[PDB]
C-alpha cells in the first residue's frame, strides 16, 4: 500500500518473520519410486544471474515439497540463506514430475494418484541488496531529489494456502485400483510397493515449554521454548 | 478508509508498490490464429485521447488483460507509471470471442475454455 520515497537501506535489514505455506495434499502409488523435478544451478556460458537447469531425481522420504516459492534448490540458488524460511533455505523442494511418470512406457510409477494444491498471496515485500538486473530506461521516467535513487524492484510474495477442511480431505477413504491408466494395472513387481504422501493439512507444530527456575513472578529467562511436530500414519492394503 | 484534507502532491510522489494480477485460464483451438481486441489511441472540449477498439492477431508473448483493461498502455498512458512495468510499455489483448464465433466458416474457434 505505502512505500514512499526516499529509501535509505542499511547493511543488515533482515527481519524475524513467519508465514504459513502453500497447502498441498497428494498420494502416489506404484511399484517404482516416484520421479520429482526441481530447478538447480546448471552449467552454461552476459549477466551474472546463475544458469537454471531442470533436474529429475528420485523423491526420497524426507524431501521437502514445494511451499509456494517454487521447486528449486535454495541451497545453491539463494546464497544468502535468508530469502526463504530456515526449513527450506538449505534444502531442495521437489515437485512430482507427473508428465514424465505418466509418459513412461510400462507405467510402473503411477498406478493411481490424487492431488489438491491451493495457495494465495498474503503479503507483498521486496528484497534488500543490489538489484542484479536494473529496470530498463524505457519502462519509467527517471526521478529527482528524494526519488533520485530507485528502490529495489526485486519483489517476492508470501504464500498462505487459505483453509483446511474435512470435506477436502483425500485420505482416510478407500481407493479401489480397478483399471489403471498405464499399462501396469497394479502389478507389484519385485514384491515391493511405493506410497508417496504429502499432507500439509495436519502440519500443527506443538509448543513445549520447560521451567528452568520456579519463581512467584513470571520472567522470560526462566523458561525454555521448544517446537515439535508429529505425524501418524496407518497404511492398509488389499492384494490380489 | 482515511484520506483527510488538506492534501496536494508535490512534483514526484510515485511509490514502489506491487500487486497480484487477475487470474485467467483459457485455451483456444483452431486452424487459424485467434483474433483479439484492445483499446488504442483513436482520432473538442476535453484533451482526453480518443479511444478506438482495434482487432489484431494474438501473437505468442502478447500480454493478457490483468485487471486494468485490454488497452495499449504505451500509447494511452504516457507517464509510464500508472501500471506495473511488465505492461506499462505493452499492449494487453483480450480474445474477441464474439468476432471469432461470428465468422462464417468458424476456423478460429473449434473449441475453447475460459475461467477468469
Amino acid at each position: 500500500t505505502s512505500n514512499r520515497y526516499p529509501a535509505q537501506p542499511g547493511s543488515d535489514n533482515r527481519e524475524c518473520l513467519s508465514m504459513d505455506y502453500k497447502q498441498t495434499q497428494l498420494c502416489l502409488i506404484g511399484c517404482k519410486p516416484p520421479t520429482g523435478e526441481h530447478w538447480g544451478k546448471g552449467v552454461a556460458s552476459a549477466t551474472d544471474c546463475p544458469p537454471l537447469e531442470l533436474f529429475n531425481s528420485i523423491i526420497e522420504d524426507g524431501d521437502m515439497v514445494d511451499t509456494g516459492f517454487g521447486c528449486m534448490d535454495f541451497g545453491t540458488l539463494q546464497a544468502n540463506k535468508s530469502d526463504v524460511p530456515i526449513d527450506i533455505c538449505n534444502s531442495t523442494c521437489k515437485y512430482p514430475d507427473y508428465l514424465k511418470m505418466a509418459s513412461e512406457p510400462y507405467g510402473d510409477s503411477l498406478f493411481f494418484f490424487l492431488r489438491r494444491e491451493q495457495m494465495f498471496v498474503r503479503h507483498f515485500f521486496n528484497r534488500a541488496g543490489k538489484l542484479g538486473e536494473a529496470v530498463p530506461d524505457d519502462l519509467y521516467i527517471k526521478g529527482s531529489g528524494n526519488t533520485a535513487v530507485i528502490q529495489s524492484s526485486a519483489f517476492f510474495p508470501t504464500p498462505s494456502g487459505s483453509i483446511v477442511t474435512s470435506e477436502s480431505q483425500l485420505f482416510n477413504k478407500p481407493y479401489w485400483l480397478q483399471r489403471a491408466q498405464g499399462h501396469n494395472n497394479g502389478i507389484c513387481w519385485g514384491n515391493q510397493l511405493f506410497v508417496t504422501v504429502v499432507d500439509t493439512t495436519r502440519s500443527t507444530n506443538m509448543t513445549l515449554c520447560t521451567e528452568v527456575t520456579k519463581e512467584g513472578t513470571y520472567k522470560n529467562d526462566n523458561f525454555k521454548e521448544y517446537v515439535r511436530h508429529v505425524e501418524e500414519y496407518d497404511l492398509q492394503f488389499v492384494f490380489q | 478508509t482515511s484520506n483527510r484534507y488538506p492534501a496536494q502532491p508535490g512534483s514526484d510522489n510515485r511509490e514502489c508498490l506491487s500487486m497480484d494480477y487477475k487470474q485467467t485460464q483459457l485455451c483456444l483451438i483452431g486452424c487459424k490464429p485467434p483474433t483479439g481486441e484492445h483499446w488504442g489511441k483513436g482520432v473538442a472540449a476535453t484533451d482526453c485521447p480518443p479511444l478506438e477498439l482495434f482487432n489484431s492477431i494474438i501473437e505468442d508473448g502478447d500480454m493478457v488483460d490483468t485487471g486494468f483493461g485490454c488497452m495499449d498502455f504505451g500509447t494511452l498512458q504516457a507517464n509510464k507509471s500508472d501500471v506495473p512495468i511488465d505492461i506499462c510499455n505493452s499492449t494487453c489483448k483480450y480474445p474477441d470471442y464474439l468476432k471469432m464465433a461470428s465468422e462464417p466458416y468458424g476456423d478460429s474457434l473449434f473449441f475453447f475454455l475460459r475461467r477468469e
Partner: antibody
Amino acid sequence: EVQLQQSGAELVRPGALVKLSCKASGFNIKDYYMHWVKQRPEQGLEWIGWIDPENGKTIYDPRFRGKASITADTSSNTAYLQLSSLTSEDAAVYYCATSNYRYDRSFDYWGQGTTLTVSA
Amino acid sequence: DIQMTQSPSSLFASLGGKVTITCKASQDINKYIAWFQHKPGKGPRLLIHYTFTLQPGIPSRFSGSGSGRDYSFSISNLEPEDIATYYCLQYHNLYTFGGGTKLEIKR
C-alpha cells in the same frame, strides 16, 4: 491547538547515552513525520533525521547515522532522540518538528527546545 | 549533497525599511525552499514555503521569490518585533539549512 512539549535541561557526563523526549498534543504522531534538528552554540541549524511513527521509518543525514538512534511510540504519542558516546561537540540545542508528506510544507511546528550540556 | 549559501550573515536597517536575504543552492531544488524566523529561547517559526507562499498569519510584508538555484527573501516595513535570525532551507532532497542572518534594527 497543536503543541510539541519537549524535555529540557539534560546534563550527562562524557561519554554516556541520552534520550530526549518530544510528545505532541492536539494531533496524532502516527499521521505526520517527526524530525530532529540540532543547533550548536553560535552555529546554525543542522537537520538530524526524521521518523515515520506509523511504521518506524528512519531517515538520517549521513553525518548522524553513527550515534543517532531515533525512535517513536505511537501509544505514548512521543518521539525519542537517542545519542550515544557524547562528546564536547555533541552539546547543543535540539528541536523536534512536524512535517507532512500529503501537504509538503517543510516543518509545520517546532518544539520549545532542549539544551544539552556535557561536563562532570 | 545540496549546500545552501546564505548572504549576508547580518543585516541592519531603520524601522520601516526593507531588507533582503539571498540564498544560492549548489544545484536546482525546483523552487522547494522555505524561510524561517528564529528568536533566542524560542523555536523556529515557518514564514514561507515553496519559495513565495506565505503561511497563515504571516504579514504580507514578508515575501520571497526565485527559481532554479537562486532565491531571495525580503522584509518591507521593518518593525521592532522583526529582530531575529532568518534561515533559508531546501527540502527538495532531504534537508539543508542556510548559514543564517542576524537582523538588527538601526536606531
